[PDB]
Symmetry: C3
Subunit: 109 residues, 3 copies
């Protein structure tokens, strides 16, 4: 167990297009389920579906939140996302700048 | 099986797509996101090097991370490619199940 | 290649964002020269959304992914913050659980 100084986490999610990504971000940010969202459009996603190699353009999303809100955030993202089962993963943040983390935590209240 | 995210790079989109297709076919990863147009910076013997790279983000499980890393390394055009594993501490239950159901 | 049971590491990745490519390259160059980071990947074309003073902001920035170790994470963050043109820049540290020992070993050798 690595030593951690914060309950903050990073959420990785993918959206089908830029318009969807911006709306999903605006939504969860507005409901204070995330403090910030970074969108990287024009990415290429590869995966198998029914035995066929799929290749589609997607938007990589990186959202910042905390453990206390990770479940609510995923539920919200999933519900508004057009896909039934979109990529929704949470990575742990072990450390960060104190001022940024303070703002991140306050943004969720 | 706990899930993980693997960060790796490829010189160009063609190579990134080829490596991704290979590991996905061998069921060593469930999905691969490629972000071309990235710039890599690092020092080498006192000289600042700058290179163009395609950032890869592969999704798999701890039980497959070793096989995935070895496969990416063996087919990689680079001698010392970036290959890092990041832990996934939580995720949507259904997506996590899909990830596992896609691996060997 | 060594597996997670036969090798270990204290490597971490740092996520930070910069306003533009010129600033990102300068920030990266600085911390790399100081051996506070071993490598840095810059991804341009990143859109950042967040509320600031009660208003939704939308900035077009560069996503930086820096590689370092727990031993240098604190110094790296202070260095990035000091040179960053932002007041409260995004600076987060994620733990690395495993990786290619050749790459991990190279990173370590490139640090203070």
């Amino acid at each position: 167990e690595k030593s951690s100084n914060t309950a903050s986490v990073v959420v990785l999610a993918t959206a089908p297009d830029e318009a969807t990504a911006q709306d999903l971000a605006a939504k969860v940010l507005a409901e204070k389920l995330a403090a910030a969202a970074t969108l990287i459009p024009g990415a290429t996603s590869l995966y198998y579906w029914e035995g066929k190699l799929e290749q589609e353009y997607e938007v990589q999303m990186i959202l910042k939140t905390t453990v206390s809100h990770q479940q609510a955030l995923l539920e919200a993202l999933k519900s508004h996302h057009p896909y039934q089962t979109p990529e929704l993963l949470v990575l742990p943040v072990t450390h960060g700048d104190t001022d940024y983390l303070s703002w991140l935590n306050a943004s969720l209240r």
